[model samples]
Target chain A: LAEFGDPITRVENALQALREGRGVLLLDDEDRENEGDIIYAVESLTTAQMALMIRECSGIVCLCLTEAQADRLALPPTVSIEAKHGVTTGVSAQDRVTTIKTAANPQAKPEDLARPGHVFPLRARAGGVLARRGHTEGTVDLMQMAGLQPAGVLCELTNPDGSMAKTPEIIEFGKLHNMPVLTIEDMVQYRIQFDLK
Target chain B: SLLAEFGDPITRVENALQALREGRGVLLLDDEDRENEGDIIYAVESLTTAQMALMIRECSGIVCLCLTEAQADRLALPPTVSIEAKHGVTTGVSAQDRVTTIKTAANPQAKPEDLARPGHVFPLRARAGGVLARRGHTEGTVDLMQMAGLQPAGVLCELTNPDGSMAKTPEIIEFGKLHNMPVLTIEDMVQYRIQFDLK
Candidate 1:
């Protein structure tokens, strides 16, 4: 897995990892679906991981966004998800953002929130998401927490329902963030290459 | 198999997954549970604040407030994942549901009660005079308590603190005593919201 680095670089590296047959971790904005969005890879597969994301965590899928683009979906015109820098005061839980190598940018647009594997339209909900300063720290923390060792993976765009973010908005988010955009349909067309079957 | 969705670099979700098992105050929503909504920043006492924020932010979803764990029980000061949605859940009300407008409904268990506070001469406190307490359902008065998914909250109460322990100050006691409402321990309320609308 990669440290949270420059948002753009992180995306590039994660994309490289996926190209090399590795899986990546994606973190949702404070406003996305799921407690924290969870994604896996065809490069690495385990029955347990699948069950975790689907049955328990809700169906996992590719999940991204930008401010000007945020409004198309009726989002706040600015980015406000705070990134914390201290330790959480519970039972010494994993500090995903601490000492983490940050990603490439101030903003991130997961080109392919439709991170493949087992993308599906499922109910989305937020219960345990972290609000990192921006997307970088949160993404870094997620990788550290999940133990994903891939250098890259497709960043996704998601709607409030835990589904793919709209094509048009995602398109703009891509231009806004310089992302590596991918869609569920696109991934499905090439699902054989990843051998997701 | 908890679905861990995030839009970021690599996959290291197991770390957070491990963190979820253990926490200060854990949240339990209907049949779902999560350590965080993937927001990776703050930990709160209850889900009410997060859900309310989403309501204001997304402007849609079915929001309901309920108690998953009794305030008297020795739970953590702040919760990890409260019940179903929002320790920082998805978008607004039914974040995952993807609705476009705020769906306002009172908790059936106590909706009418929350609605009845108009004549109760409630003694509550807030950042201000408390819209409902000072003016009943007027245009300028916003139902802060109801909006946050609680019934008789601020009407004569103190919200739960982030540490999961709500401090019942003398003012809260004075207000409860004045209003003649049974003075209960400063309680913690849980707000649960759901949405099925696709955004």
Candidate 2:
């Protein structure tokens, strides 16, 4: 949950959340100094911390990020994809643009922002479309297609307060479908980013 | 209520073993008693050395469980036989208790658990070139010896528990007795590092 850089304030904040029984704490500032190495270490530590939480606190945890950030981090297997931005036209269009840009510029300094339909490595094996924009709609479809109950999907998306704007729609959809949703605002902060490198 | 469970445990085990022999079934042995029979194909609850020899002579394909090194040595199990250790079930039980109750059934120091513990042993069928394919081991006399961690012309012994469980201590001893074949624990074997030849 520790956010690298800008002194220890952010880290202390994360620690405070953790002390307050926030099972997961997401780092919002992707502009972490130390060229993201600190971020990687933080992510690793966060993963280890989450593992301890699961083992000790019986806590379910997740990391929220754009598909691009997930790929760059080469995230470990521990983090579960509680919610993903579903495949939609907006995301697909963004993906196409990003792909074209990457192909056109091999050494693109900051990679194109993650968009929908951009083959999230994590979701590739999941056999469903990973939506970039309009994730709630996609999640509903994804859960249904996976033969999972809507309630189960809702329960997995445990964070609400810290999540992005559309999260309420996702939760409402889940509830309307009679699904059990688990919300963890501390962990949901990862989903707020407009873009990830 | 004198109600009987529909399936017979013996028949279920036998049919499963038959399927394995006929190459039509997938048998996952995860317990010591279930996976210990060296080459015998029958999943008998218990059998003596003489009985095992007779069964091996009579049956075309049978898989049996063994728990002690002595029982395996007594049977002189062949190299073609598959051996898998079932360790998960015998947790908290002492070696002597295992040897007495399941291994020998002699004056046992402890009693067996009332229920059979599942998911204790795991065995994979090895075909001629399949062993290499499954194990990803290189071919050759020296390579084979090096893989096993033994010198050439080693005296390798196969040990089993009385209850047909795979014990680690005897396996280590057997490895030391051999020159060419590497003595390996079931754990080491599963991790794909059978080559222990350091000396």
Candidate 3:
């Protein structure tokens, strides 16, 4: 999504992008400028400039920092990663790309797979796993590998996105684990998942 | 954009499921105390846990709230869902009177914090010593001094079951002596006894 500023400029830009068939155009600070769609400003953006960026950006936005910095940001709907022994896995954009690609095609060999920023149809098995985990049907698993699981064994449904499908077996699994089975919408933004240092 | 309210539990379940399947959040309000019902409905209408897990592995967060701890635990709602206990302290004249008596006895000159409501109970312990001392003196005369400062007072002690009258128990008397506080009994009040010598 292209971020636009200034109503006249943004409208002109969006018109051009639309004519060119750009899927979605995010208008930043449109609430202030009274320009485009307002997704409600996220509180985590520190400076007005950063807030503007968050307001304008499309898709998911993330801010990486130490636990202290993250806490200080006081971002609304936050997802926190606790530092164990002062260590954390810093997820890179490339790492996220790799993870998403791998998750989308579980059977594909890593070397033969598409490169970064490549979009491909998700395989059936990969799709099943994604759906079972509470992701929206047809929604791409963009940051699948960004999350690190302790002991290299990822928790079965650790961060199931709610906008996905729900099933009975999923309820049974929740009962078995004595964990509350909830939709992605019910999951708290801040979570404490442990990982190997 | 449909607004449907169901009084029957069965219909409520069906409607909630339909909403979930249509990718809508269910806003449930029911007087019936039923646990595990909503979770079952959510499960029935949506993809299995396995499918959801796979999907969540790809997307953003989720959230839920339960009114009671029992409901929360039964549903196995995510541990991350902020569960809060909304129950206030138990209400009634009995609780209020106990709290107020304690406060007034503890602080005689205490200013009324607010207008006395049915459930409003002063945190007697939070007041000044002067207020406490005065209140204590008055209540002490009415209850404790009558029993020769020997019995316990308040709702904790058993009353004369047959006659529904207060009685000074031996334990309460002993407690008073130990704590150097005067104890009183209902007998003192009936007999028109007013005061006692300072112990």
lDDT tens readout by residue for model 2, B18-119: 433332211121122422211212222322333323322221111223222222333333321322223322221221222122332211231323223321
**If both were scored by DockQ, which would come out higher, candidate 2 or candidate 3?**
3
Cα lDDT, all candidates: 0.26, 0.25, 0.24
| DockQ of predicted candidate 1 | 0.01
Docking category for candidate 3? incorrect
Comparing 1 with 2 on TM-score, the higher-scoring candidate is 1
Q: Candidate 1: lDDT over CA atoms?
A: 0.26
lDDT of model 2 at residue B70? 28
Error of 1 at B109 (Å): 4.7
Per-candidate chain B TM? 0.18, 0.19, 0.20
- Candidate with top TM-score is 1
Question: RMSD in angstroms, all models?
Answer: 21.1, 23.0, 28.0
lDDT of 3: 0.24
Local accuracy of candidate 3 as per-residue lDDT tens digits, B133-192: 333322322222112221111111111111111112433333334433223222222222
Per-model TM-score on C-alpha atoms: 0.27, 0.20, 0.17
| Candidate 3 or 2, higher TM-score | 2
Candidate 1 residue runs with Cα over 4 Å from true position: A1-14, A17-86, A90-94, A98-165, A194-197, B1-106, B109-150, B153-199
Ranking by TM-score: 1, 2, 3
